[PDB]
């Protein structure tokens, strides 16, 4: 029961909790502790063939019960160990004897009463490990401790064959090729189903719509219930004229023939619930350090995953589907993009059967029927969203106690985060206690139903982000939770959050999947990449056009108005005549909707604005949710509603409104908002989030301007490269990039001299990759981007097809005269949302992944001999319009400039290496070009988030990858402050490590007031093996992604980017780019850069601690850089930052101060007075050495106890009167007796005894604290008049 000297403090990877700062009556720390012993040969247990995972894990737990020891030892206010609480060695533990009212009988000196019998489930809970301890805010001496199995600690060390990766390196006997596991072949017209294509309107109803268009008429989409049981009289949305290509079998998604070694969890959710010994459990136990019966347990409650799954929205029983239903399901299935809103093809973690259900087959609705009228009926489903082992144990961590209920918000998922899989916390577990912590109820709710109330007016940061949902919770937010803590009076949840997918929002045309391999993979789930890849050539004019309208123009000569290669240059006007003739004329009824002839088409920003779950000023208003990000692609900190969370009922009740439409007849007129059923309570959960933020309080191009300001941890140089004619250009921002152009000459060339730009001259920097007739005509480009289908002549405006006849027949062209001067991936246009490419959803992911330092780069030429990219004589920043600028314009990460990004990385030039790596992208003009995206060389992952440390009443922060990020201005934002302070890590070994996050050993707030993070550069976990014994071309790493090849036609010498850069079939290009594919593995990139091995050098062991930069009131002030008097906001911010490149400190960017500490770092134990690293360095309470109790023989009992115990103290406050204190406590001469008080805690008139606990005014912290040296026994003593017996 006493302190164990062989157990050292530690910290769990999932929550990084090491100690709980107990405050109040008995201040101290509940530090975790473990057996540091190595020699744990987990391979000693043999995993046989027929033995199942459950039996194997039971054997592993039995084995670890002997070789491992864990406990939660309590420390005094001075950091001195008191007792251990080794749950596996506590003999005859007993629950607390309770009264009828539920109060635990407690006498301060006799302690807690014991019933003598073990708490519930003790046999199956004794072996579990503690990972977290949380105090109650109200009930004294009451604690909860979170218990998990030892497997969840040893998960990574388990044998690979039972802990597999979603991607397989294979033996590579046939050379590496990233497209091998990708289905790529395109669908082809069905020659047996041609006649069921959507019918063009027989005659457009004029209905006084005088405007007349010779163009092709709209297609009819008629759906009506009819009366047939399982079929519809009309099912136009189901028209299915396409089919998969038949080559060596049908090319479609099917787990059986693809995922032979399918990824599957360790334990299904039902098995977690049933097997009590494998799930997390929290036991409420009472602790008293100075009492005889110091500790005793209360209730034991398993965190039942079924009590969580039962609160999933019903829409999540059928993830393959969505409120759109048949039409989008068909579109995705033919495009080889996996269907639904949360698909195991993209998120296999959350499904009991894992990848074995990873396809669109059996989607829960009838599909693929020989008769299209039959398709679209609800049927049996088999693959609902669940909570298997990995997601579950990502969801256990970061407890918080509120009122009579305790919440588990989950952790960052590193407990079970492998290289190619990303478990996260999907919702909030709650345990509610009744009748004063006597009985309890366990339940959980998903984050989706909690975050539905997000609306743009809340956040001060980026707008229109993909964080919205709707009456069907098809948006599945999950968090890698940094932690939950009270920042002052406001409860804060913080960490990283997965937006709705924004990469796959555009769709390819049905014949352009062989030349957009990166995008088709992103949609396929093979490429678990979240950033938006700029591949705009093959996008359909509209993602949401049913396949029944794809073949209306097969040849493409007419540029089918309803379906054509998306390109804004042929966008229709918005004139009243144009819309009246084209769109408004075809009035739609309850049983008829039209695919309008209006040539809808726009770039990435327009695509997202129309077809992403962007936030809106009202909740549940996101009609278009495509998918959910793979990894957390956005920082997120939200102020939660404490009272509402306490008050919500345990069990949720959805209804027909949340269900999907039963059949297409009801789906067609499916409203977005329906009155909730009277007896349902799902809506009540929507308003938990009081506020939220994702980054600095900046919007639009200001955000990208800041992104330029933040530096790259890999080498420290800014992404802008501003501090020095062919000089390097910034990557994100466009200011001083390219040439200024006047937006008043774009599109209609009307009413824009003062609407977009308050300045008198509305000149906008077109950025890199801009198109211009000539320097003399840089402002606006005329219609010379004519789109020819074949080589057959320009797009031919002024044609009868592309003209509209208003009232009277005064025909005119419907296409704009002049167009914006850029469609580059870095193209920004406040004046044309249809042409602009930079978007807030991209900007958030760019901030997160720039902080992480793993932004991919397009590469044409590796460092190999005869394949070298020369910085000099081959890169010309002054000629970004021409191929000499090397801007790919296809495959690049949207919103950034590939050459600038590479220069920052140093892939070419001596920026990162002493000698030029000669790695770069060349826009070849003499032949075809092939390219591939490769990682940054760093292996930080977005889930790398540490402790949530509260700095003060208004600011909080946490470690993020190699950065420490503090949300200075979230609780109480101040105008003009960016509201973020960033502190980079200085250790090169950690920055460039293969698995750096294994080195982070927790963060905490130091007494001096500056947060700090532990670092153990000797704790890095290398990759599982040295590639066995052969060269493994694909080597998995947390940042590794199967970036598919991209092949692009020769770049024009002149007017390179007038049109979209056309690609060609790149399926066979893999074998001709081995020297580039080899750069996919991060080790090879590091070797090229020189960071491959210990060659990084520097500190050899270098164990120490890093501290965030010192901050002041003026820190983070960019009010000068904000605001507008003579420029645009982005340009003035660029000027401001440029003027402060040598003073990044005052803007909140700097290198974290780091100090060396000898020996291993395993964790901290923090108590409100001081913080002990590894629990070393306890003191003797110097400030109260001369305060102690007078022993009994030195006290005259008659002098004191002649008066009664009642009037020796104040019963109304239980305080010993000041005049008598010196009579009992020894003090040095001249000591201020008023600074020390006695807190009576027990008395008995019948025995005239007095139990007293001492307190002392701490000069350091202005709070009364107990004196631990007051007696050999501690700060509590019993005074009686010689009647102790």
From Swiss-Prot:
Nucleotidyltransferase as UniProt keyword: no
By its UniProt entry, which InterPro entries does this protein fall under? Answer: Adhesin_P1, Adhesin_P1_C, P1_N
Identify the stretch(es) annotated as Disordered.
Answer: 173-225, 781-821, 863-885
Query: Where do Basic and acidic residues bias regions lie?
Result: 182-199, 869-882
Its membrane topology, per UniProt? Single-pass type I membrane protein
Q: Where is the composition biased (Low complexity)?
A: 200-214
- Choose any GO biological process term that the UniProt entry carries and state it: adhesion of symbiont to microvasculature
Location, primary (coarse class)? membrane
Q: Name a GO CC annotation attached to this entry.
A: plasma membrane
Q: Which UniProt keywords apply?
A: Cell membrane, Cytadherence, Membrane, Signal, Transmembrane, Transmembrane helix
One Pfam family it belongs to = Adhesin_P1_C
Give compartment(s). Cell membrane
Q: Which family does it belong to?
A: Belongs to the adhesin P1 family.
Q: What is this protein called?
A: Adhesin P1
Q: Lineage of the native species?
A: Bacteria, Bacillati, Mycoplasmatota, Mycoplasmoidales, Mycoplasmoidaceae
